[PDB]
């Protein structure tokens, strides 16, 4: 029993260390640099409250829930729109004197 109690003491010490590691992971999960990036995106949105932004946000929410995705759908749409804008502004310097 002295052997088994020493073994259980070292096992509970290892469990305590793992619990401390999990607490550290929880602490670093919050107060992240991305968390720092937040609360000023809210300020940027508050510079331009609702109105057209609310409507386009509602449309975006409808698109997102219809797509049944929130990460892959957003990345795919970003890639598609970047590929679209890659071929842009073709002979856009002149529009009027040609008509004249």
């Amino acid at each position: 029993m002295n052997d088994v109690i020493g073994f259980f003491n070292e096992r509970e010490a290892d469990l305590k260390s793992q619990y401390e590691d999990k607490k550290k992971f929880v602490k670093e999960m919050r107060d992240t640099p991305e968390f720092q990036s937040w609360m000023r995106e809210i300020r940027s949105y508050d510079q331009d409250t609702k109105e057209k932004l609310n409507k386009v946000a509602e449309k975006y929410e409808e698109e997102g829930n219809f797509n049944l995705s929130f990460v892959q759908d957003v990345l795919d749409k970003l890639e598609s729109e970047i590929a679209m804008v890659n071929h842009d502004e073709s002979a856009v310097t002149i529009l009027d004197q040609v008509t004249a």
């Binding site: 609310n54 946000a57 509602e58």
Partner: protein
């Protein structure tokens, strides 16, 4: 308060306690290395086809060095 922020945000009590596998951690082999990791992301576009493309690029540059016309 806008319904947008609350819909975008995720309620903390929404998950069903996030119950883990079985009752304890799954048994593991004493080594159980299994390195694998042959591919690390990327993939998609193959490298051999564009390798032939680059070879053709240097070949056509060498051709451009050779005289053309006149």
């Amino acid at each position: 308060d806008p319904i947008l922020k609350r819909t975008i945000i995720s309620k903390r009590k929404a998950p069903s306690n996030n119950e883990d596998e079985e009752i304890v951690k799954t048994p593991r082999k004493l080594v159980n290395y299994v390195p694998l990791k042959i591919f690390n992301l990327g993939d998609s576009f193959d490298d051999t086809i564009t390798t032939t493309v680059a070879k053709l690029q240097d070949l056509k540059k060498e051709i451009l060095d050779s005289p053309r016309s006149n």
